[PDB]
Design a binder for these strands. Structure first.
Ligand SMILES: [Zn+2]
Ligand SMILES: [Zn+2]
Lengths: 109, 85, 93, 148, 83, 99, 99, 82, 108, 94
DNA sequence: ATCGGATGTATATATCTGACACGTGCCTGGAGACTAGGGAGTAATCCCCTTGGCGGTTAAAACGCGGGGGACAGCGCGTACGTGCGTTTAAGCGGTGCTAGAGCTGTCTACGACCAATTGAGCGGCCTCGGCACCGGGATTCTCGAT
DNA sequence: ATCGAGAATCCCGGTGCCGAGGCCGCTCAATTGGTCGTAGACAGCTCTAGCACCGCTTAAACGCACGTACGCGCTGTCCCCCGCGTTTTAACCGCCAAGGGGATTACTCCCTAGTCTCCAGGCACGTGTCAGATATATACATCCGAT
């Protein structure tokens, strides 16, 4: 690239590359840290954030609301397949549960 | 058969046994000496020199360390020395 | 006073990039911050373990890629690897 | 405390049946510090050699071992120049059932034969395990010059 | 100023509501004591680690971060209270 | 003459009511007192932040709900609809909590 | 006239015999072939160290043996002695492997 | 190339595994379920083992890769290094 | 303790203190490492090793052998309350399982 | 020749001869003991590292390892392990 | 198959309040230029150990049959749980006052990292003998059909 | 309740073989000695928020009654696993042979850390307003008894 603007804009990201570089350097992970690791990690983090925010926004708009609340995040995470496996052991505060009822308990015809 | 006073002497503090504990090696000694030994010595029988870590760990959770059968005998037969100290 | 850093502004920028007309509350923002921190810790720790297993002392982009492939499930891992490779390639020139 | 009574009984027991060619006793007004004299064993190159030792009793006795140190100079792989003693009884396998008489007997047995497997001074240990006459000679002059 | 028998404040209707959210249509009469016992075990397990964390830091107040750390150490990550 | 609901048609409605909400179901003061009582054994005269109690409550309620789901599945497995203590015991055993 | 053991009294003998030994209960060559066939999807022309196959075999056997205990407990909970695939499914769901 | 090797996990082997697990009576549809679950477990472990091998620019799957893959899933194994 | 002897003997331990100190310094745990941490860690490791080995030897003597195989280690670990909890997710190769048959299955 | 590979075999054998002065050990058992020691070392060291990072420190002291031992070991193993470590440190200092 | 109460849930409108989105000052952390050195890339050699083939023998697998014990369905009972009503209880909210203790700043002293010299602990390679595996014969003990 | 016969398991004595434990040579990593920069231990001050108390609603809890449906036991049927015998298939063992790739060593070069200087991006603080919660009155889905 042009080697002129900020590193986040140089790589085309929104998440900070300098802050991620500092966190990797001062986090007691290794003696040295390469020059391309923060870019990769920031890209991965931004992709995951964009995915979850898209699903949560869809859930909120399906509920006639214009703000994402923890309930919408819980619905977006639980309904999806990969995001539920990635966050299997995670508890979302004020998120509730996904509504389902076992078919045995429904009234007989 | 009943033990005498001469054969009821602790091998560490040389006093009358109080709250005695009997290790699996059939070696008996009073509770304060046992606790001081386990805290500062090598965590074994001071006489036999055998590991008693598992026994103490298992019997501490149930307060079954003391030898009540002989403790009552010592508390009843010889009130003088035990009451004095 | 002491200042506390957070990923709030970047999360808001991504949100406005995805859904331009939806806002976000405060508790949801805190949950997002916790999620980002957790994923950072997971990937960085796995990359450190990979570097230590091979008698290296540097965390390069390939170790981050291997950590991403080991952590995330199939399609998530594929898309994350693609995005990271694209970002690094665009950054290096 | 308990240490004072234990040391008093220790002195009484030592007085009842003193061991062979060793004699220990309190230095003075306090029972904590002790001084001892040891004779070189007959089956050793330390014939007729008197050795002096100082004993310091930690205040938390018997649960902590006493510390003994040579006063005179001796030629032996298990004693350093300043009087340091390398023995498992004093540091490794000490149990409260032991007595000062027992550690003195252990020191006498150490004077009987050395332990070159784990020596305090490795050079004289290897020269001892290489030849015998050199060590016997030099120990003879050491006990003739310092012990006597 | 000690407290005693405060596990009876986890009343029968509260346990019934938790079961209804869990998806339970019918409940037996001995469920409540079992639920109280499980509750006590879980709370003791979490609070022991939380108090250990707050004691290592030379504090006399347990913070939200100590509880979050204890929960994460026990394998139950919590979102929304920091971390 | 007066209206009476068939047994089970009011408990199938509370399920829908409580699976659509996010509120906490245990009263806060009794749970806070229980938390303060439990933490007396480990260290005396502690102080709790207002958020520590909330974190404990929101973790514990979620744990209880997750346990009750497995309990309901265990009860259904035995060809019943009510949940006994043995369902809780089997769920806890299989999960590995007590072993 | 020929001596025959009633059903169920030889299964207990096998239970007592196999819970006292420590060997591997799966034949080695079929398991090695299965490992190679499964691994051929991810990367071709792979080579396996002789102890990698052994580690995989030990892990797989220690996993299946531990699964069958939960399966048996589910079967007993359902008031039976015969284990059925639904027992395996319930055990896996409660453990967290199926969900 | 190899195909249809899951049937080498015969009925007697699964019966022996069940007997060690403490099972007195077995139905007839257990074996296919066991084969399926074992195949899933093997795929899950071998995928991580091969990933570890490929990162190290190797062509031989060592026991260290298998041990690390098992430890990565909360299935620590003692005896083959580590 | 007096100096002029190996570090692992001043503490009275058997596990090495220098090796543990080096492994803590180069293990990417923290920037600095205190002077008493290796001693404490080595003491804990030695205590745990002795704890396992004592029960393993007891089981070996029960089985009329003068050697310890993985079966004895498994028997020692599984039959103890705290050791089983500590090593709960751990698999021991060539260890087998404990004998346990449910009472429902026994003949009547 | 073959490169040197460190292990805990010597010290495990020393402890074994301490506790049971007449019992040997196999090779698989020795490998299992080595793996167990490595695993426990990693657990305690990692917990101490995280604990020190939480409080904004730069040093792993005996306090951090003590608290890690308190966290990781079960109810009655932790007390004895802490006692043994404290005794070892006290003996090492003086 | 519905027919009509009776209940509860969903829908539309007004409103007002506190949390969300934006703007401003600034100060600390990130960017830019430069130098030094050690970590990692690449080429070359060695030899260990992985793959492939062959023959034999024999333990384990596959196939089949007889039957008995266990899984599954159907009935009946009575008791334990659900639904509804009226009464007592303590949570929830607001407001006030006090101070224990978390949080930040300034000094300085002891502790831990770096570096050079040195030598003994621990590793690799060898070798022997006793513990454990195996085989053959016998004693003891569950098991089952018949009384 | 028992007697006895066929089958399985444990005990004991003799033989052998290989791996467990001790030994020797040596190479490098742990120990000692000295120096220096800074981490955190301690004292002092601030001001946040955690705790305690009091009064008023009214929401949730509790106790009681009725009835009914579901858990549990019993009985019957049938069919599918189990135990045993005979035959077929391929696993296991010992052996030989080839070379692929893992593991070590030497040289080089360039990528990253440490340092100094500089400035703007993000954090704390303040403010305005509109999205959503609450209150109130209809509209319709749903359930239950009755022919
Ligand atoms: Zn005493
Ligand atoms: Zn004894």
């Amino acid at each position: 690239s042009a080697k002129a603007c900020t590193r986040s804009s140089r790589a085309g990201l929104q998440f900070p590359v300098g802050r991620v570089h500092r966190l990797l350097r001062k986090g007691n992970y290794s003696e040295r840290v390469g020059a391309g690791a923060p870019v990769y990690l920031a890209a991965v983090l931004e992709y995951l954030t964009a995915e979850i925010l898209e699903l949560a926004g869809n859930a909120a708009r399906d509920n006639k609301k214009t703000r994402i609340i923890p309930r919408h995040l819980q619905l977006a995470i639980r309904n999806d397949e990969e995001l539920n496996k990635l966050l299997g052991r995670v508890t979302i505060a004020q998120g509730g549960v996904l509504p389902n009822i076992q078919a045995v308990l429904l009234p007989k015809k | 058969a009943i033990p005498s006073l001469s054969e009821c002497q602790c091998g560490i503090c040389m006093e009358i046994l109080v709250e005695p504990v009997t290790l699996p090696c059939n070696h008996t000694l009073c509770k304060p000496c046992f606790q001081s030994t386990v805290e500062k010595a090598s965590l074994c029988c001071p006489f036999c020199r055998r590991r008693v870590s598992s026994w103490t760990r298992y019997h501490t959770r149930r307060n079954s360390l003391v030898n009540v059968e002989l403790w009552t005998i010592i508390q009843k037969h010889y009130p003088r020395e035990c009451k004095l100290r | 006073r002491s200042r506390k850093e957070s990923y709030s502004i970047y999360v808001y920028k991504v949100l406005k990039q995805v859904h331009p007309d939806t806002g976000i509350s405060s508790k949801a923002m805190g949950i997002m911050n916790s999620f980002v921190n957790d994923i950072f810790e997971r990937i960085a720790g796995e990359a450190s373990r990979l570097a230590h297993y091979n008698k290296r002392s540097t965390i390069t982009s390939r170790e981050i890629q291997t950590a991403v492939r080991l952590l995330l499930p199939g399609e998530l891992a594929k898309h994350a690897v693609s995005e990271g490779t694209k970002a690094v390639t665009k950054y290096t020139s | 405390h308990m240490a004072l009574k234990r040391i008093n009984k220790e002195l009484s027991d030592l007085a009842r049946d003193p061991p062979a060619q060793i004699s220990a006793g309190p230095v003075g007004d306090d029972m904590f510090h002790w001084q001892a004299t040891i004779m070189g064993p007959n089956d050793s190159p330390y014939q007729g050699g008197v050795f002096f030792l100082t004993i310091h009793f930690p205040t938390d006795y018997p649960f902590k071992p006493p510390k003994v140190a040579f006063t005179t100079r001796i030629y032996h792989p298990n004693i350093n120049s300043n009087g340091s003693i390398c023995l498992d009884i004093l540091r490794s396998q000490w149990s409260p059932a032991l007595t000062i008489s027992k550690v003195l007997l252990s020191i006498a047995s150490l004077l009987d034969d050395p332990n070159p497997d784990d020596p305090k001074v490795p050079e004289i240990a290897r020269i001892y395990k290489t030849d015998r006459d050199k060590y016997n000679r030099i120990s003879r002059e050491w006990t003739q010059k310092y012990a006597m | 100023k000690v407290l005693r028998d405060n596990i009876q404040g986890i009343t029968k209707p509260a346990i019934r509501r938790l079961a209804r959210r869990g998806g339970v249509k019918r409940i037996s009469g001995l469920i409540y004591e079992e639920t109280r016992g499980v509750l006590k075990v879980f709370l003791e397990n979490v609070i022991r680690d939380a108090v250990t964390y707050t004691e290592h830091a030379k504090r006399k107040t347990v913070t939200a971060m100590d509880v979050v750390y204890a929960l994460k150490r026990q394998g139950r990550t919590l979102y929304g209270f920091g971390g | 003459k007066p209206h009476r609901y068939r047994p089970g048609t009011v408990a199938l409605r509370e399920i829908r009511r409580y699976q659509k909400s996010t509120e906490l179901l245990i009263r806060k003061l009794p749970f806070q007192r229980l938390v303060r009582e439990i933490a007396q054994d480990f260290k005396t005269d502690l102080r709790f932040q207002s958020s520590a109690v909330m974190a404990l409550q929101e973790a514990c309620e979620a744990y209880l709900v997750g346990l009750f789901e497995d309990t309901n599945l265990c009860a259904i497995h035995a060809k019943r609809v009510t949940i006994m203590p043995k369902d809780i015991q089997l769920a806890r055993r299989i999960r590995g909590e007590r072993a």
